Design an enzyme around this catalytic site. Sequence first.
Site, PDB file in Angstrom:
ATOM      1  N   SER A   2     -49.941  17.758  29.903  1.00 27.40           N
ATOM      2  CA  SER A   2     -50.350  17.005  30.992  1.00 27.40           C
ATOM      3  C   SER A   2     -52.296  17.048  31.257  1.00 27.40           C
ATOM      4  O   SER A   2     -52.691  16.516  32.045  1.00 27.40           O
ATOM      5  CB  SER A   2     -49.830  17.421  32.379  1.00 27.40           C
ATOM      6  OG  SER A   2     -48.396  16.993  32.538  1.00 27.40           O
ATOM      7  N   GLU A  42     -42.142  12.028  27.532  1.00 24.44           N
ATOM      8  CA  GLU A  42     -42.002  12.259  26.161  1.00 24.44           C
ATOM      9  C   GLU A  42     -43.293  12.834  25.531  1.00 24.44           C
ATOM     10  O   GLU A  42     -43.098  13.376  24.358  1.00 24.44           O
ATOM     11  CB  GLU A  42     -41.809  11.079  25.641  1.00 24.44           C
ATOM     12  CG  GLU A  42     -40.255  10.415  25.845  1.00 24.44           C
ATOM     13  CD  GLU A  42     -40.127   9.655  27.224  1.00 24.44           C
ATOM     14  OE1 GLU A  42     -40.940   9.259  27.846  1.00 24.44           O
ATOM     15  OE2 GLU A  42     -39.002   9.371  27.476  1.00 24.44           O
TER      16      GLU A  42
END
Length: 265
Positions: free
Chosen positions: A42, A142
Amino acid sequence: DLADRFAELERRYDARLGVYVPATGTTAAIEYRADERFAFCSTFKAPLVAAVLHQNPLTHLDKLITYTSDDIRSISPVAQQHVQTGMTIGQLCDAAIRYSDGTAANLLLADLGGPGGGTAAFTGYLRSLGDTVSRLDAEAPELNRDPPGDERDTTTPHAIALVLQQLVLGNALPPDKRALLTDWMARNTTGAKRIRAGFPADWKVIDKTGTGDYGRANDIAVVWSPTGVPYVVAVMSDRAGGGYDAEPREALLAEAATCVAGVLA
């Protein structure tokens, strides 16, 4: 000898550790596996918000984005509670950074537009900052789940640190847009146990975390000393030998950050 201490951390945590702290007017760079590839996880959401900021006037932050429950495909603490009402671009930027909201990031990628749901456009934004190495290929979740040998969705500590340097401390963004990115990172809710945990309380820390498969745990930060001197700290880690379900280790990042703080104080 700092490299020896990092190597010891790797042995203790059964992990691979990457560190980059850019040189400053008065300090040397810190680098450990700084040119090896690690998954973004992230962490990409901070430069993603920068990309959106870069290519739009700030009035765009008020643009209402609508979406459905079927768009909640990744961990989305904010977006999943606003399906009926939608969220503004500004609110999506806030969520993507401060709650690492996956749907928010996917909607911001879509806002850039183009092939791969905006992932090619995101990569293009990094290229515009002189980053020839990083790439984003997949949407959330993903992008967190590539096998260790895969170069998709990877950066390097060196690359991402120099991107963040330009974004927060440099002039990649005008001051108004720069201040928004900085504030969102400053009020992050996900990073208390990573770089923050390795710096004394009188240092300010702004950050964006990443976590994924194969024990991936990352944190990218800008830290300010008690007298207001800034540094960029990128720390990345994985456990490719520990299975796709190897436990990510926040404590490894905190200790690596402690070692960095020792150098910088």
